[PDB]
Design a protein around this nucleic acid. Structure first.
Ligand SMILES: [Zn+2]
Lengths: 50, 49, 50, 380, 49, 246, 74
DNA sequence: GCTGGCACGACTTTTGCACTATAATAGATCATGCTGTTGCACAT
RNA sequence: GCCGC
DNA sequence: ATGTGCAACAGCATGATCGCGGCAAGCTGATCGTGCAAAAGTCGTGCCAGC
């Protein structure tokens, strides 16, 4: 399985069809609720908690 | 790829299930134009096939 | 305590009948790495890269 | 558990939306219909065959009368002569002797299908089977004189008759003895004969109901909170089941308390407890207790597996106080079996013996107790 | 005949034993089950004449 | 009355399967009875419970030509209903045919029609699915009639707005927040005049946005009038049940 | 033994009608009321009917005229 | 005279009526149709 | 679920 | 010169993702009490007919 920690990803940069690469960060604990950070195509910091 | 092949075959079979040769000759003068398949400097399909 | 322990041991995805043809199958089954399981990744969720 | 059985055969229909679906079973009547459909019969013959095979019991004997079958047809030209022929044709099916009117006819048809050269064919075809059957039921000492035959030949004729199948058609049944005993009331032996209960599954039901109803309610995906949409149904179910288990345990504890002696030392030590006796003990009405303990089953090392077998009101006007007729019947069965080879066991004699032992019971009751599960050993 | 015609199965077996080799088909039980299923909703489906 | 073959007549000539909505009267016509108790069978005698999900007074008998209590158990008796039990002597194969029904005592909405992306109720009443779902679950009120007051025909006034209207308007406000309200508002529709108004609006004003919606709504309207169905039947008050053997 | 049914196909050419013709001829020769018109070589009725079609003495029209003749006879 | 299946007056059992805070859980694309918000184009 | 094609 | 109408973009919910076969494994339960007439059913007891 995936080790708990912090992982940064770019989702291959093909989601909005504009060629803009989107970076996201995930915090995964061994037990608990996940925490997430995401980039909007308008460059806005958004979180996705649980 | 077998799942994709099966789904495509299912869709084709259903879209073409109710087609049967039910007549001897329609008598229409219509048709389509047949020419050998050419592509640049190479030939793929002669008119015979 | 007994219910949880026995439920884990007797009925789980990662606790299966071991193969008994040859000693080789037992050896291979014992040191086996699986990506599935309770906290793992399902078959149909698996992309071409995993 | 020192020794545990392997899992019994079980399955459930998978990869099929109507789960568990079903599975057809072949019974005696179904097999008879299958055989009927493959023999040349007229339409009237087919109707008569269906009508007569509908009346075949589980043991393979006809329950309804032949004249009643003719009346059931309710049509002219279907007099008893035709139905007799149809039934006689039907009798010679795979369970040979099936659909027989009586024992005599069954033995006659069973003996009919033979090589016609057996050593005692004509000896028992009608002299023993079609005549003096009641004599053969007894010792048949005078049967040899009646049939003008030696007792040595009869000694083999009786064996030949007994070689036949008594109840044909009962070898076709496909039912499984799965009517095993849950014994939801378990009991072990202790310093005071404590009684416990198993198969409650109350923690499991509580956990499942939580993880489903309160699991969905605690899940924040749905807007608002399902504090009463799902949470306040599991509580009601758990409370109802807890109350039912509590009253069952209370009734069982009362039953063991009033019936400790039946379980201690001799088995036949049951008091004639009435419904009011437990009703006053548990401060509950008799109707609820009767509805509760009427097919619940206990698991005793020696006692019977029931909760209504103890509930007897059979004072029987005993000499000292009262007694229970269950113990009286058990004592009568024990004494009747342990007697002389002649074994008189007269009703008056049995009543006198019981009165001497202290059970003041009339001579007519003891006959009923004996006839309930036994027969008089030539007491007439 | 081979799967769902409850009367068809017995009739065809009787024909085979006799040596007729005749079909006498009917209505599969599965379609009746499906009709009962759809009718068990608020939807009406029927076999018109 | 003998030599009867109900198995042969079970197969009938047919063609062109047709499908339509079922009125409550038709559901009652299919039914052999009404169930009122939830438990399927009792463990007291291992027999189907009276007026339950598994019953023998309806759905047919349980074991061939026998009947409950064993008063009439033989083939000589046919189609006879016992006095003790309503069980009828029958080939016990009708456990797969007799349907039964339940009475809801309160109208409910068919999930088949309300919850689908092209919702039929929503585009039949020209209201969004959101407010329809809100009123169907008692979240908000919907008023009807009320011509004298300033309230509209399809108002979506909430509880606070309802209290304000009651304080101000008093009477003349006919608002309900159950399935009875949506049933009544569907009943009160005059379909032909609605279709004529749709045609007039569509031909009078041309716009690529509203044209598709108007065409869909008039198509549904003409389908409803020509098919003979009544739009009230989308919500159901009588619910049938599957035969026990299935 | 008719391993290949080409000649029978060409006698009445549809590859679909000869199935029905052979089925009805086999029904006549199996159910009853008919006898083979070709020497029977311990073959089943299906291939006997196929051989009869191949020989050119069995087809739909003559079957119909024989049926009409038997209907008029009774 | 001895014995073994039938009924009667208390007792016993059955049946409808009848109201009764915590928690498994998140790792696919891929396409399609509908709804809400915003920006472009025309009018007095 | 594991395996075979 | 400001206001109104319409087309386009982003977000959201819905539906689908090849067959055929052999081991396997767990059982998916129940429910509620009421206190009472009203009914049906049952048991200890005495009867006449057969041996
Ligand atoms: Zn009945």
């Amino acid at each position: 399985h995936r080790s708990p920690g912090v992982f940064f990803d770019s989702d291959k940069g093909k989601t909005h069809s504009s060629g803009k690469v989107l970076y996201n960060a995930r915090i995964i604990p061994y037990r608990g609720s996940w925490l997430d950070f995401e980039f909007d195509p308008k460059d806005n910091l958004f979180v996705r908690i649980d | 790829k077998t799942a994709n092949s099966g789904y495509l075959t299912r869709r084709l079979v259903d879209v073409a299930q109710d087609l049967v040769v039910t007549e001897d000759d329609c008598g229409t003068h219509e048709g389509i134009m047949m020419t050998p398949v050419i592509e640049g400097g190479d030939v793929k399909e002669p008119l015979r096939d | 305590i007994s219910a949880a322990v026995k439920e884990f041991f007797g009925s789980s995805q990662l606790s299966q009948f071991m193969d008994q043809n040859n000693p080789l199958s037992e050896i291979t089954h014992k040191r086996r790495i699986s990506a599935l399981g309770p906290g793992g990744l399902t078959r149909e969720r698996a992309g071409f890269e995993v | 558990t020192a020794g545990t059985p392997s899992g019994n055969g079980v399955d459930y229909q998978d990869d099929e939306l109507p789960v568990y679906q079903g599975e057809t079973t072949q019974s005696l009547q179904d097999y008879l219909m299958w055989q009927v459909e493959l023999t040349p019969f007229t339409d009237t013959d087919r109707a008569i065959a269906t009508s007569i095979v509908d009346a075949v019991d589980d043991t393979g004997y006809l329950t309804i009368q032949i004249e009643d079958i003719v009346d059931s047809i309710g049509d002219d030209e279907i007099g008893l002569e035709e139905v007799e022929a149809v039934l006689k044709r039907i009798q010679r099916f795979d369970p040979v002797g099936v659909a027989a009117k009586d024992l005599r006819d069954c033995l006659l048809i069973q003996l009919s299908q033979f090589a016609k050269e057996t050593p005692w064919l004509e000896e028992a075809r009608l002299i023993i089977s079609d005549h003096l059957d009641l004599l053969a039921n007894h010792d048949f000492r005078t049967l040899m004189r009646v049939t003008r035959l030696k007792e040595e030949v009869l000694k083999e004729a009786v064996n030949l008759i007994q070689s036949l199948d008594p109840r044909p058609g009962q070898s076709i049944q496909t039912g499984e003895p799965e009517y095993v005993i849950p014994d939801v009331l378990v009991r072990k032996v202790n310093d005071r004969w404590v009684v416990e209960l198993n198969s409650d599954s109350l923690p499991r039901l509580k956990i499942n109901q939580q993880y489903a109803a309160m699991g969905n309610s605690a899940r924040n995906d749905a807007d608002g909170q399902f504090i009463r949409s799902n949470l306040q149904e599991a509580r009601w179910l758990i409370k109802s089941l807890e109350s039912a288990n509590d009253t069952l345990l209370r009734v069982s504890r009362c039953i063991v308390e009033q019936q400790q002696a039946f379980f201690e030392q001799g088995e036949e030590y049951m008091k004639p407890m009435v419904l009011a006796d437990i009703a006053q003990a548990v401060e509950m009405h008799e109707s609820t207790i009767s509805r509760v303990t009427t097919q619940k089953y206990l698991h005793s090392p020696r006692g019977i597996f029931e909760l209504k077998y103890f509930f007897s009101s059979h004072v029987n006007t005993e000499g000292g106080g009262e007694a229970s007729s269950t113990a009286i019947r058990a004592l009568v069965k024990k004494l009747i079996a342990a007697e002389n080879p002649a074994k008189p066991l007269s009703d008056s004699k049995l009543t006198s013996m019981l009165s001497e032992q202290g059970i003041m019971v009339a001579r007519r009751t003891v006959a009923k107790y004996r006839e309930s599960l036994s027969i008089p050993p030539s007491n007439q | 005949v081979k799967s769902d015609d409850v009367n068809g199965r017995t009739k065809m077996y009787k024909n085979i034993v006799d040596g007729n080799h005749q079909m006498e088909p009917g209505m599969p039980e599965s379609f009746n089950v499906l009709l009962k299923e759809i009718r068990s909703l608020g939807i009406n489906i029927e076999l018109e004449d | 009355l003998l030599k009867f073959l109900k198995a042969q007549t079970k197969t009938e000539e047919f063609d062109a399967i047709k499908i339509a909505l079922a009125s409550p009267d038709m559901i009652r016509s299919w039914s052999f009875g009404e169930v009122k108790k939830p438990e399927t069978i009792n463990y007291r005698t291992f027999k189907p419970e009276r007026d339950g999900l598994f019953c023998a007074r309806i759905f047919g008998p349980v074991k061939d030509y026998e009947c409950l209590c064993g008063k009439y158990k033989r083939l000589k008796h046919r189609g006879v209903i016992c006095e003790k039990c309503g069980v009828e002597v029958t080939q016990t194969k009708v456990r797969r045919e007799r349907m039964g029904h339940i009475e809801l005592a309160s109208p409910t909405a068919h999930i088949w029609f309300l919850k689908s992306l092209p919702s039929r109720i929503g585009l039949l009443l020209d209201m969004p699915l959101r407010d329809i779902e809100r009123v169907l679950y008692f979240e908000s009120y919907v008023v009807i009639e009320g011509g004298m007051t300033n309230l509209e025909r399809q108002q979506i006034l909430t509880e606070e707005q309802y209290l304000d209207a009651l304080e101000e308007f008093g009477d003349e406000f006919d608002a309900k927040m159950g399935a009875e309200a949506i049933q009544a508002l569907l009943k009160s529709m005059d379909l032909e005049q609605e279709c004529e108004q749709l045609r007039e609006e569509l031909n009078e004003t041309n716009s690529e946005t509203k044209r598709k919606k108007l065409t869909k709504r008039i198509k549904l309207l003409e389908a409803f009038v020509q098919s003979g169905n009544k739009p009230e039947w989308m919500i159901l008050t009588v619910l049938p049940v599957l035969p026990p053997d299935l | 033994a008719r391993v290949t049914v080409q000649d029978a196909v060409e006698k009445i050419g549809n590859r679909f009608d000869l199935v029905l013709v052979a089925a009805r001829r086999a029904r006549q020769m199996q159910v009853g009321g008919k006898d083979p018109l070709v020497p029977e070589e311990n073959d089943k009725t299906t291939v006997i009917a196929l051989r009869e079609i191949e020989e050119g003495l069995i087809n739909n029209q003559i079957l119909d005229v024989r049926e009409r003749q038997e209907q008029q006879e009774q």
